Structure 1
Amino acid sequence: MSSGRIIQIIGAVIDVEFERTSVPKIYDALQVDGTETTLEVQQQLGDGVVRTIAMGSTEGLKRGLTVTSTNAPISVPVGTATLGRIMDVLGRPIDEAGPVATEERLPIHRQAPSYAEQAASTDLLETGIKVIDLLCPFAKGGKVGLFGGAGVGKTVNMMELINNIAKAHSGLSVFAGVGERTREGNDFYHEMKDSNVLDKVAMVYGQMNEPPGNRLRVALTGLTMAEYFRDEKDENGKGRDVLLFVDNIYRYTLAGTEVSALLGRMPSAVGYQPTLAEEMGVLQERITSTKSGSITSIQAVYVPADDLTDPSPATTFAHLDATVVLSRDIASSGIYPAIDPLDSTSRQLDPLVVGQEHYEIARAVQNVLQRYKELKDIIAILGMDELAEEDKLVVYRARKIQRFFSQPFHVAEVFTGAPGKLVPLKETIRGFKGLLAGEYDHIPEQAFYMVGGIDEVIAKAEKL
């Protein structure tokens, strides 16, 4: 029979004994009879014994308690009914708005797409931030790290990205909070509901007061929902394009270390689990672009002890394509979004990928910014008049460039009456090619501030 009994409890690690014929598969989910508690199978110790991790508090559980099996991994609800809801790891509503109205379930443990299913190209993902597009472009099926802490507007960037992807490509989104502070999770929920973004997102929260089991599987749950969004097709096939936000993947790595320590496995180099690389690969390799659709992920990253050569960020960096680094001083000077235009990198910025003109325009912009940074200390020490005229032009055009990287967001439309602007490519490139050639040297700096394409810049200059 499937039913078995608990024979050992040590903190969050519970052993179960089945009869020797009916031992369940690994990663099967067990339900404790009489209570609400789900156990995930981790390893089979033989003689009918199975060692499991409990998803929730274990207090009040006693030995000799009957346990029933489900003969399948953890299943979560998927579909269009999950949009606008908050869910835990097991796929249950924690927003207090009734049961999920869908009927379709999927297991959260499934194989990554094979070699034959990979896409026939890796082109781009256009989105009109006007800084992301030019300097650090995204790519469908890519993975973009997001450096920088709170106070510079991470959440606002996530809002604007969700709004843009839903508006342009008709794509949905999924937010997977790995170790989400309850206060900041509630604040994010209300911020995303008062703006009307929330009708487009399916949220999953594993709070940091839960056992290390939940914080390790919330990312897989969010990934399963994103995969189901991608796979489903309207007429003419062509499934949608989806984003998947995973905040502070470092917490995912730490939750991986903790459950390995609980199971009693010998630690690796710096204390991380021996399966660190495999645990990262299982997640990061299901995020890719197939024939039907694609999944793009924006993942916050925390570098421990500011050392980017220890195993966690050294392993994460293997999978990332682009890195968007936010800066404190940029936000201090009233420039939003506060994306650093000089330290943000992208592997997609190659002449073979983005064409020829775009690469040269971006490199010239970066060169001008670098030279201006080299000139500012000379300005501070030796007076403005010491510089030659070429440096005068460099300073003026660099200030114009730094202004032009600012634009209003659609989410700020509620706070500030200025509507958000989505400026596409072939319009930022024109503006920067004109600006780098001196064609706009007669425009004052202030006309390049919080505005879209070059045409509105000309108009605002006319009104100055």
Structure 2
Amino acid sequence: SSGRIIQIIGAVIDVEFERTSVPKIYDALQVDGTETTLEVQQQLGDGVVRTIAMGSTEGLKRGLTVTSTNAPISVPVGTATLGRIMDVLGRPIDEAGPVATEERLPIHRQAPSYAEQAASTDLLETGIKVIDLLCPFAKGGKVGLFGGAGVGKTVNMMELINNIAKAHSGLSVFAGVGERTREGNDFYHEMKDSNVLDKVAMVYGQMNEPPGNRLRVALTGLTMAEYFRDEKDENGKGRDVLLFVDNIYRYTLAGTEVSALLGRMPSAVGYQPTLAEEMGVLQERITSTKSGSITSIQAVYVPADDLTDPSPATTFAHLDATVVLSRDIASSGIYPAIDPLDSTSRQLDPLVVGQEHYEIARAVQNVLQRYKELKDIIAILGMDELAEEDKLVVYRARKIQRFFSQPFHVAEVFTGAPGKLVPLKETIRGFKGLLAGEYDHIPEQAFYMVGGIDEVIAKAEKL
């Protein structure tokens, strides 16, 4: 009824068992005399199972006793996890006391069937108006921030965190393993001071912990997001949830880590990987059912300055939208600093969103592209010599690029500005009006940090 450790090689721990009681795949076992828990991965015959240690490893010796829980690893999930930080097993680490939630779920579950898929393709609306018009997201999609370390990516995550609550009353989950660069306060404090802390649940893990801890974190985040989505209100409907799975440091590692979101190990099981069956369900677990929709935002690095096709593109296979952070525009100070041209989305099509949005969104990219191509000749020889036909193009491009800037509610406690949450239809109306040229008389500086069009005209009249 009790086993013994047989072979400790790296993270792989082969454990034998009695003949009539051998743990089924994915079962969890507890090692007496130490803090560590084992997860079953594959069976090897002769009553021997190959497992991976989950807790921190210390002073392990051959032949240690082990007792079986007979059930998968269950993580506490509920409403009390909001504003807390937990271990990979759900044990809190923020010194704030135990989590009072009493219900838990297994972290290894099956995919929703073909009969549980949604009957349409809806667009998730966020507060940010650059992202919404140019790179629309999709409820159940997969997002990639292709952003380098220098730009302020975190404030974008915070703005999403705040707006989903307000926009759709949907909770969020954050999971990440370690930190790549330190240029500002650690996320926890940077979220505490902005008061978005109670709308999110956080799972974290270092690198000096065993490779088991580094793995199986996205699964815990996914289980929490699933519980948030499935919970129903008095109207008998679910919520829309965002899963912020942090990149694992570098993309070389993210090659495995991107594929870790696709269920691939970074050489944890060097003999016989077990991913085809574990992986590939991970890509599915993220979907929009009729009741609730869950979406995934993942950050990645672009050191070569090469993204998409220039980049390895292995990420490009499954990503539905790519958000690009530009250092030049950030130097400009237009925050959020998102490139309006390089960022792309597959949901920008005449069928999914309609012909109106497609016609409006496609036109602004053309004007931006033309302005970017003539900026050099404008620089060398000046604006005056340029024909008036292109001068209108330049003026309109400046207006839209200024309008892309937006006050953020998460930074209100610092700047003091009232902040804005611009609905999508109003963004469409304002962009169509600007493209047609009704706002031509409107002077500049009425779009920088001015939020919504009516606020544009209010700013114009107030000065």
TM-score norm. by structure 2 comes to 0.92
Listed one character per residue, the Cα deviations across residues 287-335 of structure 1 (whole Å, up to 9, x for unaligned) are: 1101110101111123575666899953432222111101000110110
Checking the alignment, whether the CA contact within 8 Å between 2:12 and 2:269 is kept in structure 1 is no
**Aligned mates of 1:257, 1:321 — CA distance in 2:** 19
Question: By how many angstroms is 1:122 displaced?
Answer: 1.1
Going from structure 1 to structure 2, the CA distance change for 1:31 and 1:344 (only over 3 Å counts) comes to: same
Going from structure 1 to structure 2, the CA distance change for 1:41 and 1:200 (only over 3 Å counts) comes to: same
Going from structure 1 to structure 2, the CA distance change for 1:66 and 1:315 (only over 3 Å counts) comes to: same
**Aligned mates of 1:4, 1:37 — CA distance in 2:** 14
Question: By how many angstroms is 1:271 displaced?
Answer: 11
Checking the alignment, whether the CA contact within 8 Å between 1:39 and 1:54 is kept in structure 2 is yes
After alignment, is 206-215 or 300-309 more displaced?
300-309
Checking the alignment, whether the CA contact within 8 Å between 1:265 and 1:273 is kept in structure 2 is no
Checking the alignment, whether the CA contact within 8 Å between 2:147 and 2:302 is kept in structure 1 is no
SS of equivalent to 2:313: helix
**Aligned mates of 1:264, 1:126 — CA distance in 2:** 29
Checking the alignment, whether the CA contact within 8 Å between 1:266 and 1:273 is kept in structure 2 is no
SS of equivalent to 1:342: coil
Going from structure 1 to structure 2, the CA distance change for 1:287 and 1:262 (only over 3 Å counts) comes to: closer
Going from structure 1 to structure 2, the CA distance change for 1:37 and 1:275 (only over 3 Å counts) comes to: closer
Residue 105 of structure 1 pairs with residue 108 of structure 2: no
**Aligned mates of 1:19, 1:288 — CA distance in 2:** 41
Listed one character per residue, the Cα deviations across residues 161-215 of structure 1 (whole Å, up to 9, x for unaligned) are: 0100011211100001134459689711011111211111000112222222222
Cα root mean square deviation, aligned: 3.5
Going from structure 1 to structure 2, the CA distance change for 1:204 and 1:216 (only over 3 Å counts) comes to: same
SS of equivalent to 2:328: helix
Listed one character per residue, the Cα deviations across residues 79-103 of structure 1 (whole Å, up to 9, x for unaligned) are: 1111111111111101111111111
Going from structure 1 to structure 2, the CA distance change for 1:394 and 1:259 (only over 3 Å counts) comes to: closer
Report the counterpart of residue 411 of structure 1 in structure 2.
410
SS of equivalent to 2:425: coil
SS of equivalent to 2:80: helix
Checking the alignment, whether the CA contact within 8 Å between 2:251 and 2:300 is kept in structure 1 is no
Checking the alignment, whether the CA contact within 8 Å between 1:212 and 1:255 is kept in structure 2 is no
SS of equivalent to 2:374: helix
Going from structure 1 to structure 2, the CA distance change for 1:225 and 1:186 (only over 3 Å counts) comes to: farther
Checking the alignment, whether the CA contact within 8 Å between 1:178 and 1:251 is kept in structure 2 is no
Going from structure 1 to structure 2, the CA distance change for 1:339 and 1:109 (only over 3 Å counts) comes to: same
After alignment, is 293-302 or 155-164 more displaced?
293-302
Going from structure 1 to structure 2, the CA distance change for 1:134 and 1:307 (only over 3 Å counts) comes to: closer
Percent same amino acid at aligned positions?
Answer: 100
Question: By how many angstroms is 1:375 displaced?
Answer: 0.8
SS of equivalent to 1:374: helix
**Aligned mates of 1:401, 1:262 — CA distance in 2:** 36
**Aligned mates of 1:390, 1:174 — CA distance in 2:** 49
Checking the alignment, whether the CA contact within 8 Å between 2:258 and 2:315 is kept in structure 1 is no
Checking the alignment, whether the CA contact within 8 Å between 1:277 and 1:315 is kept in structure 2 is no
Listed one character per residue, the Cα deviations across residues 372-430 of structure 1 (whole Å, up to 9, x for unaligned) are: 00110111223323311101111111111110100100011011010210010221112
**Aligned mates of 2:245, 2:374 — CA distance in 1:** 39
SS of equivalent to 1:256: helix
Residues paired across the two proteins, number:
463
After alignment, is 225-234 or 379-388 more displaced?
379-388
**Aligned mates of 1:259, 1:361 — CA distance in 2:** 34
The structure whose residues are more often helix, as a share, is 1
**Aligned mates of 1:418, 1:114 — CA distance in 2:** 47
**Aligned mates of 2:258, 2:443 — CA distance in 1:** 59
Listed one character per residue, the Cα deviations across residues 22-50 of structure 1 (whole Å, up to 9, x for unaligned) are: 11111111110122111111221211222
Checking the alignment, whether the CA contact within 8 Å between 1:88 and 1:94 is kept in structure 2 is yes
TM-score norm. by structure 1 comes to 0.91
Checking the alignment, whether the CA contact within 8 Å between 2:253 and 2:266 is kept in structure 1 is no
Going from structure 1 to structure 2, the CA distance change for 1:325 and 1:402 (only over 3 Å counts) comes to: same
Listed one character per residue, the Cα deviations across residues 255-292 of structure 1 (whole Å, up to 9, x for unaligned) are: 89599999999999999997777765332211110111
SS of equivalent to 1:248: coil
Residue 303 of structure 1 pairs with residue 268 of structure 2: no
Where do 5+ consecutive residues of structure 1 fail to align?
A: none
Question: By how many angstroms is 1:448 displaced?
Answer: 1.2
After alignment, is 407-416 or 63-72 more displaced?
63-72
Superposed, 1:182-331 pairs within 5 Å as 187-248=186-247, 254=253, 281-303=280-302, 314-331=313-330
Checking the alignment, whether the CA contact within 8 Å between 1:179 and 1:251 is kept in structure 2 is no
